[PDB]
Amino acid sequence: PRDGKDALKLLNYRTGDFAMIAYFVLKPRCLQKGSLTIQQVNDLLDSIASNNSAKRKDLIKKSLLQLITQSSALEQKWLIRMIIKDLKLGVSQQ
DNA sequence: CTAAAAACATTCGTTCACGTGAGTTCCAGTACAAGTCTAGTC
C-alpha cells in the first residue's frame, strides 16, 4: 500500500542503510530458501544493465521481479547492496 | 698490691641501598577500515 508503513519506510529512508530497511520489509514476505545460483544472478544483473543501456525498463522490471520472487530476504539485501555498489564487509579490498 | 674504671674487641639484629628474576597489567605504538576530494548550470 502506498500509504502503508512499509511503503513510507522504503521511501523515507533519510536520503541503518536502505538494505536493512528492505530486509526488514521483505522478511515476512520472502521465502526461507532461494533457488538462484551465482551464474543466474550475474546473468540477471547483466540483462538489467544492458536493458538500461538500451532504454527498455520493462525488461529491467521483469528481471527485478524475478530476482525478488526467487530469493530470500538476506539474498534481497545482499543483491541491493551489490547493485548500489556498497557492501562494507569490514575487510578492505586490499 | 689490689680492685675497679676505662677502653677495646666480638657477635648479633635491624635498617637501608642496590641489583636482579618473575608475574601482572597498563598504555604508546602500530595496523587496518572507512570517508573525503569544488561548485554550479543546463
Curated annotation (Swiss-Prot):
Entry's family note: Belongs to the ATP-dependent DNA ligase family.
UniProt source species: Homo sapiens
Subcellular location: Nucleus
Quaternary state and interactors: Interacts with XRCC4; the LIG4-XRCC4 subcomplex has a 1:2 stoichiometry and XRCC4 is required for LIG4 stability. Component of the core long-range non-homologous end joining (NHEJ) complex (also named DNA-PK complex) composed of PRKDC, LIG4, XRCC4, XRCC6/Ku70, XRCC5/Ku86 and NHEJ1/XLF. Additional component of the NHEJ complex includes PAXX. Following autophosphorylation, PRKDC dissociates from DNA, leading to formation of the short-range NHEJ complex, composed of LIG4, XRCC4, XRCC6/Ku70, XRCC5/Ku86 and NHEJ1/XLF. Interacts with DCLRE1C; the interaction is direct. Interacts with APLF.
Protein name (database record): DNA ligase 4
Residues of the full protein shown: 100 to 201 of 911
Function: DNA ligase involved in DNA non-homologous end joining (NHEJ); required for double-strand break (DSB) repair and V(D)J recombination. Catalyzes the NHEJ ligation step of the broken DNA during DSB repair by resealing the DNA breaks after the gap filling is completed. Joins single-strand breaks in a double-stranded polydeoxynucleotide in an ATP-dependent reaction. LIG4 is mechanistically flexible: it can ligate nicks as well as compatible DNA overhangs alone, while in the presence of XRCC4, it can ligate ends with 2-nucleotides (nt) microhomology and 1-nt gaps.
Disease with which this protein is associated in UniProt: LIG4 syndrome: Characterized by immunodeficiency and developmental and growth delay. Patients display unusual facial features, microcephaly, growth and/or developmental delay, pancytopenia, and various skin abnormalities. Severe combined immunodeficiency autosomal recessive T-cell-negative/B-cell-negative/NK-cell-positive with sensitivity to ionizing radiation: A form of severe combined immunodeficiency, a genetically and clinically heterogeneous group of rare congenital disorders characterized by impairment of both humoral and cell-mediated immunity, leukopenia, and low or absent antibody levels. Patients present in infancy with recurrent, persistent infections by opportunistic organisms.
Entry comment describing in which tissues the protein is expressed: Testis, thymus, prostate and heart.
